[PDB]
Amino acid sequence: TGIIMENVTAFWEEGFGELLEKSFSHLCLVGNPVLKNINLNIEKGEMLAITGSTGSGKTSLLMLILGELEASEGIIKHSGRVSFCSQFSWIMPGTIKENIIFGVSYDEYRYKSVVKACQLQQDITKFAEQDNTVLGEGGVTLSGGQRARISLARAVYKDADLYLLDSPFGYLDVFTEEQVFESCVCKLMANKTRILVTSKMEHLRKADKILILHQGSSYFYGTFSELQSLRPDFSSKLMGYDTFDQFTEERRSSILTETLRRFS
Numbered sequence: 607t608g609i610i611m612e613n614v615t616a617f618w619e620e621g622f623g624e625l626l627e628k629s630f631s632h633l634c635l636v637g638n639p640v641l642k643n644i645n646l647n648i649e650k651g652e653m654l655a656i657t658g659s660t661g662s663g664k665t666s667l668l669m670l671i672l673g674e675l676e677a678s679e680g681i682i683k684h685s686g687r688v689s690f691c692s693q694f695s696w697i698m699p700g701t702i703k704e705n706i707i708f709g710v711s712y713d714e715y716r717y718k719s720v721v722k723a724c725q726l727q728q729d730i731t732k733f734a735e736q737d738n739t740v741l742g743e744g745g746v747t748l749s750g751g752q753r754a755r756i757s758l759a760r761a762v763y764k765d766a767d768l769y770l771l772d773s774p775f776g777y778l779d780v781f782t783e784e785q786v787f788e789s790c791v792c793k794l795m796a797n798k799t800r801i802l803v804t805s806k807m808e809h810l811r812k813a814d815k816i817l818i819l820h821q822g823s824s825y826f827y828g829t830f831s832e833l834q835s836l837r838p839d840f841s842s843k844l845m846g847y848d849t850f851d852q853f854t855e856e857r858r859s860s861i862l863t864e865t866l867r868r869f870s
């Protein structure tokens with residue numbers, strides 16, 4: 607399946623705020639849209655890069671696809687299993703391997719292929735028992751990027767038609783993330799429909815389609831080249847840094863926010 611949204615709007619409802627926490631009642635009382643007039647049309651096998659300002663509705667858009675948020679107006683269409691990799695990297699008690707194949711059946715070629723493309727080999731090779739290493743919930747003594755690669759691997763190992771990847775590339779080990787984006791998202795998953803939330807411009811550059819969000823609104827939908835001509839101010843400033851993508855995630859996101867505020 608591909609995915610289409612035709613003029614979709616979703617309002618704050620009781621619970622969504624608490625769901626997201628993993629005052630809301632005021633937002634629910636005043637009937638405020640969390641997302642307004644969203645359009646997108648992604649074919650089978652394409653990658654959509656979602657970016658925007660902080661708290662612009664990026665995660666909320668994913669929740670709509672998952673059915674955790676209701677589309678009060680408009681048309682959404684997709685079929686098949688979805689696999690969701692949350693910004694929060696959860697880790698269950700058990701080995702690394704058990705965490706990647708959690709609730710699903712081990713297949714040798716599939717496993718090794720996902721391990722390798724998620725750049726996990728460089729990690730497990732530092733441990734005496736490699737992917738048989740036992741973790742506690744939270745996987746608390748690992749780095750953020752290590753937790754995020756195990757969690758991404760878990761999501762990518764699942765056999766689904768649509769992959770939702772919420773901000774996996776947000777940590778300090780920025781060269782590894784560059785390698786993960788190439789080998790996992792661009793190669794291994796080249797023919798899987800996929801939605802990547804991100805604040806790196808390279809990911810926009812390589813995307814089939816682009817969605818920029820600001821304040822629950824679609825600032826821009828289309829291709830990288832349309833961004834460049836249809837949003838010359840935004841693009842000029844964002845392509846203007848020499849290595850924007852190696853800034854911390856907080857800096858990248860604060861530059862996007864400020865830029866979106868400027869050229870609204």
Ligand SMILES: Nc1ncnc2c1ncn2[C@@H]1O[C@H](COP(=O)(O)OP(=O)(O)OP(=O)(O)O)[C@@H](O)[C@H]1O
Pocket residue numbers: 626627640658659660661662663664665666667
């Ligand atoms: N942890 C939170 N505390 C208070 N409000 C929140 C929180 N998380 C989400 N919200 C609310 O939900 C709305 C949209 O949030 P959402 O998480 O979908 O945006 P986002 O683009 O994913 O944010 P971020 O840039 O931090 O990842 C915000 O306007 C805010 O009202």
Ligand SMILES: [Mg+2]
Pocket residue numbers: 664665666693
């Ligand atoms: Mg988010």
